Design an enzyme around this catalytic site. Structure first.
Site, PDB file in Angstrom:
ATOM      1  N   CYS A 117       0.787  -1.225   0.000  1.00 21.83           N
ATOM      2  CA  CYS A 117       0.000   0.000   0.000  1.00 21.83           C
ATOM      3  C   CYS A 117       0.826   1.286   0.000  1.00 21.83           C
ATOM      4  CB  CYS A 117      -1.002   0.023   1.156  1.00 21.83           C
ATOM      5  SG  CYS A 117      -0.244   0.258   2.720  1.00 21.83           S
ATOM      6  N   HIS A 149      -2.039   1.494   7.326  1.00 24.58           N
ATOM      7  CA  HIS A 149      -2.322   1.552   5.897  1.00 24.58           C
ATOM      8  C   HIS A 149      -2.046   2.949   5.349  1.00 24.58           C
ATOM      9  CE1 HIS A 149      -4.389   0.692   1.999  1.00 24.58           C
ATOM     10  NE2 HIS A 149      -4.055  -0.546   2.290  1.00 24.58           N
TER      11      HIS A 149
END
Ligand SMILES: [Cl-]
Lengths: 251, 75
Positions: free
Chosen positions: A27, A203
Site C-alpha cells: 500500500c 495503511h
C-alpha cells in the site's frame, strides 16, 4: 500473486489508470503510484489490465531519477529514496508525533514523499482541549511515548506515574489512530485538489480534499468493475461511509 | 497455562499457551484470534521486549501473567 489489476476511470475528462490492491498488498507503493497516475506523470497504455511490482518500480524510478534540484543535499536524498523502494512494497516504518497532521519523526522512508512533492499526513492528534493530555504526550513521537510510558510505570514518583497513566489512556482511547481534532486539522490544513498520502492503522492511502471534504481513493479489488466507485469519505471515527465517483458525486 | 494479553483499546484477550512455546507462536496465536499481523506485534513484559526466538520460560512468564502488546507503526 505479485500482480495488480489496473482500473480505468474518467479523471478530469481523461481516461486514467489507478491500481487496485490485494488483501494487505503493497500500500505505500500503491498510495504513491496512484498519485503519480492521477497526475499523469506516469502513463500506461489504454489496454493495460494488469501490472507488476517491478513495472511500478520502473515507472517510479523514471519519476524519481528525472527530478531536477531547486547540488549535494539533493543527491543524498535521492539515494535514500532509492534505498527505500523495496520497503515501499513490503511495509514502511512511520513514527508519528501527536502535535500535528504533518508531524512525523523524519526518516529516509519519508524522503520519497518529499522528493515527489507529496505531502504525508496522519490524523492521530492529541486533543488541545485537554491540557493534562497535551502536557503528558508533549512533543513525543509514538516510539518515544511507549518508552516513556514504560519508564513511568517503573517509577513511584507521583509526577512520572501520573504522566504515564495519562499517556496510557491517550493511546487506549485513540487506538483507531484518528481523532476528531486530527480530522478538523486535516480539513483546515490540506489544500484543495492536492493529492497526498494519509497514514492510519498501518495503511497508506491516497488522499485528497475536494470542496472542503476529505476523500480516500478506493483501491479495494472488490470494486474493480464499478467505475462509479472511486472516492470514499474519510469519515471519522467510525460509521457509514459514502462513495463518490471520479467527479466527487455520490455514486 | 492461561495468560493475558492487554490490547491498547483496553480489551484483555486471554491466551492458552505452554512455557516452552516461542514468542513467534504467541504472536501467531494473537493474530489467529485478533487478526493483527505478527510483524506488527511487539510483546512487553516486566518492562522488557520479548524476542521471537526465545520461549516463555526464558522470561519466567508464569500462569495468569499479563503481557503488554505494543503495535509498531508499519504500513
Ligand atoms: Cl496535486
Amino acid at each position: 500473486p505479485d500482480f495488480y489489476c489496473v482500473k480505468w476511470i474518467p479523471w478530469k475528462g481523461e481516461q486514467t489508470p489507478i491500481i487496485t490492491q490485494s488483501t494487505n498488498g503493497p500500500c505505500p507503493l500503491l498510495a504513491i503510484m496512484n498519485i503519480l497516475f492521477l497526475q499523469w506523470k506516469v502513463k500506461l497504455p489504454p489496454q493495460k489490465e494488469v501490472i507488476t511490482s517491478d513495472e511500478l518500480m520502473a515507472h517510479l524510478g523514471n519519476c524519481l531519477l528525472s527530478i531536477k534540484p531547486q547540488q549535494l543535499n539533493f543527491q543524498q536524498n535521492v539515494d535514500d529514496a532509492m534505498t527505500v523502494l523495496p520497503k515501499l512494497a513490503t511495509g514502511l516504518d512511520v513514527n508519528v508525533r501527536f502535535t500535528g497532521v504533518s508531524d512525523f519523526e523524519y526518516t529516509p522512508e519519508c524522503s520519497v514523499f518529499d522528493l515527489l512533492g507529496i505531502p504525508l499526513y496522519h490524523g492521530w492528534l492529541v486533543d488541545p482541549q485537554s491540557p493534562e493530555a497535551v502536557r503528558a504526550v508533549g512533543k513525543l513521537s509514538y516510539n518515544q511515548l511507549v518508552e516513556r510510558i514504560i519508564t513511568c510505570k517503573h517509577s513511584s514518583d507521583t509526577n512520572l506515574v501520573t504522566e504515564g497513566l495519562i499517556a496510557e489512556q491517550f493511546l487506549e482511547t485513540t487506538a483507531a489512530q484518528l481523532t476528531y481534532h486530527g480530522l478538523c486539522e486535516l480539513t483546515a490544513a490540506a489544500k484543495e485538489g492536492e493529492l497526498s498520502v494519509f497514514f492510519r492503522n498501518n495503511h497508506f492511502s491516497t488522499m485528497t480534499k475536494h470542496k472542503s471534504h476529505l476523500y480516500l481513493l478506493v483501491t479495494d479489488q472488490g470494486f474493480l468493475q464499478e467505475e462509479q466507485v472511486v472516492w470514499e469519505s474519510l469519515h471519522n471515527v467510525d460509521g457509514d461511509s459514502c462513495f463518490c465517483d471520479s467527479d466527487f458525486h455520490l455514486s | 497455562m492461561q495468560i493475558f494479553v492487554k490490547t491498547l483499546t483496553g480489551k484483555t484477550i486471554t491466551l492458552e499457551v505452554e512455557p516452552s512455546d516461542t514468542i513467534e507462536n504467541v504472536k501467531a496465536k494473537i493474530q489467529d484470534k485478533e487478526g493483527i499481523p505478527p510483524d506488527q506485534q511487539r510483546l512487553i513484559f516486566a518492562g522488557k521486549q520479548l524476542e521471537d526466538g526465545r520461549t516463555l520460560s526464558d522470561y519466567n512468564i508464569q500462569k495468569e501473567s499479563t503481557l503488554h502488546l505494543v503495535l509498531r507503526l508499519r504500513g
